[PDB]
Homo-oligomer: A and B are copies of this chain.
Amino acid sequence: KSVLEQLKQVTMVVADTGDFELIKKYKPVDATTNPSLILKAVKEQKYSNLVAETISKVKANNPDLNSDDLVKEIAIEILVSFGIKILDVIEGKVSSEVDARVSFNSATTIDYAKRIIARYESNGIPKDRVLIKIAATWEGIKAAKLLQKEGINCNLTLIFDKAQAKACAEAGVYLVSPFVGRITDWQMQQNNLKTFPAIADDDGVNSVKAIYKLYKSHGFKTIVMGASFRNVEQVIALAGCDALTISPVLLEELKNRDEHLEVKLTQISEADFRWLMNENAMATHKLAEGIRLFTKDTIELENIIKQNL
């Protein structure tokens, strides 16, 4: 058995891509998108017809919207159209991320999430097949608490800190996506490291291990999904995690190796949360950075939509 197939025995394998054509090579259970991956699927142009049809559809269904509102509605429908194509090739769920610009507004986050779900449902996809990805700021967590109460399952993303993860679980979220790679990136930058750290010393791997241990010892039922990978050894290190979302490149690396895979993994108030985050210099920087960078990619996507109206 390949390492990929070994991993599937102990972990829910998830594909991290909007390039739905790649997903059948790997037979993951679930798939995840993010604003950068949607932009890449739009930019690389394998799906220009899907984009063009989406734009036409939204214009016809929305004669009342001005150019700004129309572009926003198209951005949502693009996210959903990719998700629908992904759902055609997997048995599980797809994750679709809200506009990062709403990250500090629980209200607009709730509305955005509900609009994504409504668009899926209008296209005949039931909400049980979708996770709404939300950056794990306090405001995102508070939004997810409400959405979960209303039956909308959330994927809390940009998780860099254990207390941050704990708060998510306290809110009853379906799933959390603690990051690995971006933490390793910070670690390597801090000391100008030229090579990846040994696995035992990899701050990103250790961050997910710590969250896993917290959740299992405490009996939290939220799914732990490691995300953000720089090398295949980081993914292998976390075998046994509830779920791991993995790029098509790294899925291919796992598919082509066949050594033995060792299985390794077997209330907070607002003020408390803000304090614990502030104590984590890396998490404070990297949460903020993720929201800035995803916003830049969403603006690039909007500019592409505008050029094709």
A positions within 8 Å CB-CB of B? 101, 103-105, 108, 137, 139, 270-271, 274-275, 278-279, 281, 284-285, 288-289, 291-292
Interchain CB contact under 8 A, A291 and B271 = no
Interchain CB contact under 8 A, A288 and B292 = no
List B contacts of A108 (CB < 8 A).
Answer: 271
Interchain CB contact under 8 A, B279 and A292 = yes
> Could you tell me the distance between the alpha carbons of A288 and B139 in the complex, rounded to whole angstroms?
18
| From B139, B275, B289, contact of A101 by CB (8 A) | B275
> Could you tell me the distance between the alpha carbons of A270 and B142 in the complex, rounded to whole angstroms?
15
> Could you tell me the distance between the alpha carbons of A274 and B137 in the complex, rounded to whole angstroms?
10
A-B contact pairs, 12 of them (CB 8 A): A101-B275, A104-B270, A104-B271, A104-B275, A104-B278, A105-B271, A137-B274, A139-B274, A278-B288, A281-B289, A281-B292, A284-B288
> Could you tell me the distance between the alpha carbons of A289 and B270 in the complex, rounded to whole angstroms?
19
> Could you tell me the distance between the alpha carbons of A104 and B271 in the complex, rounded to whole angstroms?
5
List B contacts of A101 (CB < 8 A).
Answer: 275
Going nearest first, the 8 A-B pairs with the smallest beta carbon separation are A104-B274, A105-B271, A104-B271, A284-B288, A278-B288, A104-B275, A285-B285, A278-B291
List B contacts of A291 (CB < 8 A).
Answer: 278
- Which residue on chain B has the smallest CB distance to residue A104? B274
List B contacts of A105 (CB < 8 A).
Answer: 271
> Could you tell me the distance between the alpha carbons of A103 and B285 in the complex, rounded to whole angstroms?
18
- Which residue on chain B has the smallest CB distance to residue A276? B104
Distance to closest chain B CB from A51 (angstroms):
28
> Could you tell me the distance between the alpha carbons of A108 and B137 in the complex, rounded to whole angstroms?
22
> Could you tell me the distance between the alpha carbons of A271 and B109 in the complex, rounded to whole angstroms?
12
Distance to closest chain B CB from A138 (angstroms):
9
- Which residue on chain B has the smallest CB distance to residue A277? B288
> Could you tell me the distance between the alpha carbons of A291 and B278 in the complex, rounded to whole angstroms?
8
